[PDB]
Design a protein around this ligand. Structure first.
Ligand code: BEF
Ligand code: BEF
Ligand code: MG
Ligand code: MG
Lengths: 131, 131
């Protein structure tokens, strides 16, 4: 039933993530975006329950996408996934009411749990970044 | 089922919280402490699945009890419940790996849901304090 959008600029990771998401029993479909611009374009057109957003992407970052979602009052759940432990990225995401913030140090099983958590109206913040 | 400890120095609130908790079908027992020192004495004697801790109490604050629990590595989830939005309190709790941090502006139903969240191995922080 889950309609998922994955915005990630590294083709190999995006592809791998999306393939594994598609094999999940509760996942209906997975939209792909290579940057923040394609991400917003898809959110302007398609039904999306949850967006998994990389931070550092060309054209528009995942944080910009999150802010757009908030400014437009979309109810999309947003999970930021990033390699970066930069405090400013986290602070900016929290100010923008992100639902979850996950480092790419986490596993795919970890990510899956996170998705379930936010679908249930809960939040999850990288322990490393709460710090 | 769940063995709960409530440390809260306001008698009426502590009494009321504990009665409602005891009425929960999945609650086995509720221990009461009126200050931080009593809470530690009880934790040195009985097993507790979740400790619900007020911050400002006599002798030792709930933040000190939380740090004590963590230093003893007890298998005890800790939910801090407080009137106060002080950033220092919240920062101290997070550094000690608090499981949930809940303002007394929340409802008993909110608190109940929080108890299940931490037992499910997840965390919950007051939106106000995340800022
Ligand atoms: F490039 Be992402 F932020 F990992
Ligand atoms: F006194 Be408690 F911290 F509400
Ligand atoms: Mg990137
Ligand atoms: Mg008090």
């Amino acid at each position: 039933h889950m309609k998922v959008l994955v915005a990630e600029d590294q083709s190999m990771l995006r592809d791998a993530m999306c393939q594994l998401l598609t094999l999940q029993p509760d996942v209906e479909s997975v939209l792909q975006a290579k940057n923040g611009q394609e991400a917003i374009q898809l959110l302007e057109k398609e039904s999306v329950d949850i967006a998994i957003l990389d931070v550092e992407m060309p054209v528009k970052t995942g944080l910009e996408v999150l802010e757009w979602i908030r400014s437009e009052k979309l109810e999309t759940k947003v999970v930021v996934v990033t390699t970066f432990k930069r405090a400013g990225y986290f602070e900016r995401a929290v100010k923008a009411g992100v639902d979850a913030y996950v480092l790419k140090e986490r596993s795919i099983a970890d990510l899956m749990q996170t998705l379930h958590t936010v679908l249930e109206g809960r939040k999850e913040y990288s322990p490393e970044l709460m710090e």
